[PDB]
Design a protein around this ligand. Sequence first.
Ligand SMILES: CN(C)CCc1c[nH]c2ccccc12
Length: 259
Amino acid sequence: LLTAVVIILTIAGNILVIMAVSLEKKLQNATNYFLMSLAIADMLLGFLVMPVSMLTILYGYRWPLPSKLCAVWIYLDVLFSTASIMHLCAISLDRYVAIQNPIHHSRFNSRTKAFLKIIAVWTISVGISMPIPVFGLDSKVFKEGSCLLADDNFVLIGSFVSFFIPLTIMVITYFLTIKSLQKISNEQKACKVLGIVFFLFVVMWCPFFITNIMAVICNEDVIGALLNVFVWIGYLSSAVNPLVYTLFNKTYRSAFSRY
Ligand SMILES: CN(C)CCc1c[nH]c2ccccc12
């Protein structure tokens, strides 16, 4: 159905971002290397998890794949989602320390900061998702002919650290960054871009996490039919992070117009 366009555009945008990074020497700084790591974490979403959800949807929520890949597929989904969330959380914090005091950010501006930041966010993304192979693996991962999470203590308590803390950091960091920038037109264009990025992240991922948190804290068919669309809306963020984090730059616009 409409998810095929999501898969195709998720492939196309991330591939074009990777191709524009690879054969351009003007975009080789550390800030853009973190975005290359984001496109690495985002290419693998649309080819390893979303076709699996595709033929899960086309089979009427009865999974034709074998039962041995349920915990692995759930672990891949949680790993790529927490990676593509933590990437934006570290991007916002780096953007804050590069907006507040540019001198002390440019003092330590190197590839060492990018290596440490990528290592930290990937350690967080693996360490959040690592209990799913070792505690969920079939009652914690399989239910009624579909591969869905059912260990409610992990679904609630994992969503606290994997989303409601990095969302609290985006809230406090967007407040301080827009207060510092509000304290001229270049600055206001960055204010509009920051507002679009923040008000799209809290719109595209948040409904799934308040839906699953409310379903754990509490109408089962209504919550299931909401989850079956809000996961795909969560997948639509992977159709956007290649686009809206590069297309406001002139070099990336020229590179995309070249292809
Ligand atoms: C379905 N996908 C978007 C879930 C991503 C996710 C990140 N953290 C989680 C914690 C529990 C369940 C799912 C997730």
